[PDB]
């Protein structure tokens, strides 16, 4: 019932600025210390700084300069202002609370879902969505498999969903992979029982916020 939600994430040009917000719901927070921690894709956790119950703020030696933390208790919100972004600052930025009763101690109990910030000179690109239809012999066998191919987009992420959430079992949404074009691509597959085909409708829902691309493709065998 208690979670931190980060926002402001997205595509940024090198040298640009951006302000991420951390808003809590379920607790006051004005009395807790908030930290911002980041993680480059595939890399590890890197602390950026913290802001105490009182406005007092501390930063990682390398962040004190292009990064600024602030809070607005009347809104129950913490803010991270990023300046002169570098390609190296591309990462998932997390919001996390220090265990009540500590300070300076690296104990963070409550985290946010994290929001991805991509610093790149490239323009956003929307994905095409093609169906991966099961074989015509998909009857009998050991259940059928069908899916969606989300191709050519930038930057990450892309969330895929089956039957608006109804279908979750046997779902595999593969990690995206770069293509020679410098664009991402992935596929989401789902195994279902042969009998379900024809009688049950299967639609994958693809959403790529950066380009305001939303698509619902109905996968059908022929």
């Amino acid at each position: 019932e208690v979670q931190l939600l980060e926002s402001g994430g997205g595509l940024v040009q090198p040298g640009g600025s951006l302000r991420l917000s951390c808003a809590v719901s379920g607790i006051d927070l004005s009395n807790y210390a908030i930290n911002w921690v980041r993680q480059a894709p595939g890399k590890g956790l890197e602390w950026i700084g913290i802001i105490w119950a009182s406005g007092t703020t501390f930063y990682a030696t390398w962040a004190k300069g292009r990064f600024t933390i602030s809070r607005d208790n009347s809104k129950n919100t913490v803010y991270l202002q990023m300046n002169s972004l570098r390609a190296e600052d591309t990462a998932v930025y997390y919001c996390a609370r220090t265990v009540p009763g500590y300070s300076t101690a690296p104990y963070f109990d409550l985290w946010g879902q994290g929001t991805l910030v991509t610093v790149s000179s490239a323009s956003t690109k929307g994905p095409s969505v093609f169906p991966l239809a099961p074989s015509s012999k998909s009857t009998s066998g050991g259940t059928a498999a069908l899916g969606c191919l989300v191709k050519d987009y930038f930057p990450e992420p892309v969330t895929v969903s089956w039957n608006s959430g109804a279908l979750t079992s046997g779902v595999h949404t593969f990690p995206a992979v770069l293509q020679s074009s410098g664009l991402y691509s992935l596929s989401s597959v789902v195994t279902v029982p042969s009998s379900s085909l024809g009688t049950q409708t299967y639609i994958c829902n693809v959403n790529h916020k950066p380009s305001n691309t939303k698509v619902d493709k109905k996968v059908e065998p022929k």
Binding site: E46, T61, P106, F108, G114, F130, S135, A145
Partner: protein, 216 residues
């Protein structure tokens, strides 16, 4: 500077085994300021232990931490398939501005072999309109992760024109899923008839083949 060394960088253990991860920092951390976090793919880190040995609420007794100064250990008594994740250590150094995390330890599960269910997907007509053809081969729910997928167009063994993608280890059955995508230009796709996917894996006596004839 601080230097926070965590080893091993990765490790595989069977469910029920004991897993030991150590974290060694050059400057002895500040008075007991050492913590352990668990991070499952796509999710955020989760505090398991702080103060080097205190477990947070709701953390299974199979987790426990020990050590002090410059050497600490995280120990998982009876490894469960749900424990698949990357573990990190955090250290304080009376500077606050020196807070650092270890490089992390990727903990994966060792389970028995399980053969893959193989499927193949021809390119859709919509995509053929765009001038490009993508052929997809799906290897589903198998272990070990190592598998060899080879593309054969009219028997001609392809090479350099396909990319693979693997899902993270499943937290329930500890298996993997892999996709292999052959990507060609429309002219090249229509230049051939038989598109086949040949899979070799520990769970199969002989490699299995999946194919389709373009057109028919």
């Amino acid at each position: 500077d601080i230097q926070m060394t965590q080893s091993p960088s990765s490790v595989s253990a069977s469910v029920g085994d004991r897993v030991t991860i150590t974290c060694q920092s050059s400057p002895s951390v500040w008075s007991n300021f050492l913590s352990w976090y668990q991070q499952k793919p796509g999710k955020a880190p989760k505090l398991l232990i702080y103060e080097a040995s205190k477990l947070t609420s709701g953390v299974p007794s199979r987790f426990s931490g020990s050590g002090s100064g410059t050497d600490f250990t995280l120990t998982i008594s009876s490894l469960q398939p749900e424990d698949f994740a990357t573990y990190y250590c955090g250290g304080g150094y009376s500077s606050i501005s020196d807070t650092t995390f270890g490089g992390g330890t990727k903990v994966e599960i060792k389970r028995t072999v399980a053969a893959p269910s193989v499927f193949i997907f021809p390119p859709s007509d919509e995509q053929l309109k765009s001038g490009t053809a993508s052929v997809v081969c799906l290897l589903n729910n198998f272990y070990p992760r190592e598998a060899k997928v080879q593309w054969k167009v009219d028997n001609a063994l392809q090479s350099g024109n396909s990319q693979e993608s693997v899902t993270e280890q499943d937290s329930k059955d500890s298996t993997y899923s892999l996709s292999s995508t052959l990507t060609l230009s429309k002219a090249d796709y229509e230049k051939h008839k038989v598109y086949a996917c040949e899979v070799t894996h520990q769970g199969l006596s002989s490699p299995v083949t999946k194919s389709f004839n373009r057109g028919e």
